[PDB]
Point group: D2
Chain length 199, copies 4
């Protein structure tokens, strides 16, 4: 089997004025596309190296596998985490978990914003679920290091803070992007991911 | 003493069409400015922590010091490494060193381009001088990790491959930026840095 | 200030048979002593670099500062975390927190053992307190990276899993060391550290 | 394929008094054996993950693959780099390369000793061959990160500076171990590895 670029679940201009059409089109059709293709190339090289017992070759392929693999994992989640129907607050058990674990929805937003603003260089802020503790948890990841593969936490909501995710529109002012993105968070999707972790 | 933002040695539009005016203005007046200011803040916090023997506080400040400090170091070099009078090939002893160490000027360009294109996420490609071996050396650095502070190599020529260095103009196509930047390399400056390493 | 090697709170053979006297003597009088001495040297170099605005020099000193500084921080806590009168289970609010956060004392032991066994290369397992969440948390740290300086978690109980902490007695069998050390945990000290986090 | 633990090319006590028999026996029959066994387990898990397109699982397996795989790579080279008939200086083209690249054999020894002493935590010092530059190069690697897999340099001579490589005999005094090991370097093997890089 081969990994493929998932279609975007909405039109490229559906998240304006929060994230512009040019960004969405580049981000999906150029950036994610590249990760998917380079992941498939890397996986094939890895299969050859594994079959030959070439451990040196396997290890040389790790950065490309984590980078492109992580890129595919993260952006596949990210597109579903956004929606033109998004924004506002979550409801039901996710909201209850947020209040219990972070005090309030606004305190939660502050913590995820702070983690996302705090990434030095390229990376991601995440709300995840800690299976072992049975509660929510915030973490930041560098580059395309994916949340579950590197920490064990199950991803619920990711915020891409690579410059490509915002620069054309917001330039250097990452906090303006982080303010805007709250308006398009697909809480339906984040709730679905959360409910799949429980039971 | 306090670190300060060096003036750009040319006008913001001096490197068009290779690097556009909007990029130069943002990169110098917003990005580098931020690094300089946050470096001075970090250094003052470090001086307090040192005076108190607060080792925990010193260690907590390391990421900000490397990031903002490195940002200041790297961009201060980068502005002088470019010029509207740049491009072409170097001459004299630098050219002789390039031919001796890399075979030819074009082979050297291939290696520095490859290191620069190869940065996954944010970072820099460098031509440096290895004092101990007495020859040239190429290295890549992540984020704002500066060359001399992290490797001991003396920086001669740096290529910023953070998305902010090219994205407004070249979008995702980093190789187009790397082709363009060869036209504005200030070989006079790179030669001056090289000659200061010898003797 | 000049950092100093804290006196051990018991004699070198007080933790026998669980950690032998030769290990305790080497670990305190050679390993920790070296961290203290090299920390003082590094801090003086940093003071000179700061006074000169030498950011390159500050950054070059970071590995020595984190390693020796972290070494001092970690081992100063570690000695107080152990006692000849230790072992068994904690009581009062710490025990209540352990049961609440990890299910039971035995489940907690399993998780901290697993984190400590899981360190590949040199490092530490920690029980810490997350100030922001107001609960207990287990984390692992590489090398001498200290818990609070690198994660913000307040250290309560640390387990050194550098080979020097066990190798003379247990050789490669780190799990035997981790089983043994439970017999000398100073729960009085861990409780004091925990109570200082609350209120 | 199933990786296997290579036989040692001499008996466990053949490198006495420089590295004692207990160390060699533990290092080969326990440490390297564990890397081989855990590598085979990890490779099988990776084959399942690859067949399923489970990229998360592939990425979660990277630390075990690099650690155990790197451990296998590094120690397989290390055993052949030592010999009871070793020590003294190399001859022929390797000696000429050492003199050309480092000034002299004694200056080379100083640099490889310094790189090996300089490892903070667990790792290796290496003399390698840079294929691209066509000359010798010294590098250090953390943990079990292997030289060729992580840097592209071809390994010629490795020095293990994990505490398990010396602690039973030399305790904390790593420099005494590094002085001793020069007496058992198998220059015949290092020459064979060097000659395979050329032509
Ligand atoms: K629209
Ligand atoms: K907007
Ligand atoms: K112009
Ligand atoms: K152009
Ligand atoms: Mn992205
Ligand atoms: Mn920049
Ligand atoms: Mn220790
Ligand atoms: Mn070893």
């Amino acid at each position: 089997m081969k990994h493929s670029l998932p279609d975007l679940p909405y039109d490229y201009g559906a998240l304006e004025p929060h994230i512009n059409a040019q960004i969405m089109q580049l981000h999906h059709s150029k950036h994610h596309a590249a990760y998917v293709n380079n992941l498939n190339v890397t996986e094939e090289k890895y299969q050859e190296a594994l079959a030959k017992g070439d451990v040196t070759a396997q290890i040389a392929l790790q950065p490309a596998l984590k980078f492109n693999g992580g890129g595919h994992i993260n952006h596949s989640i990210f597109w579903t985490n956004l929606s033109p129907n998004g924004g506002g607050e979550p409801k039901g058990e996710l909201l209850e978990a947020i209040k219990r674990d972070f005090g309030s929805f606004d305190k939660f937003k502050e913590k995820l914003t702070a983690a996302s603003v705090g990434v030095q260089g390229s990376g991601w802020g995440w709300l995840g679920f800690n299976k072992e503790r049975g509660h929510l948890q915030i973490a930041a990841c560098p580059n395309q290091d994916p949340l579950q593969g590197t920490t064990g936490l199950i991803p619920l909501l990711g915020i891409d803070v690579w410059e490509h995710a915002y620069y054309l529109q917001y330039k250097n002012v990452r906090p303006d992007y982080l303010k805007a993105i709250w308006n398009v968070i697909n809480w339906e999707n984040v709730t679905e991911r959360y409910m799949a972790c429980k039971k």
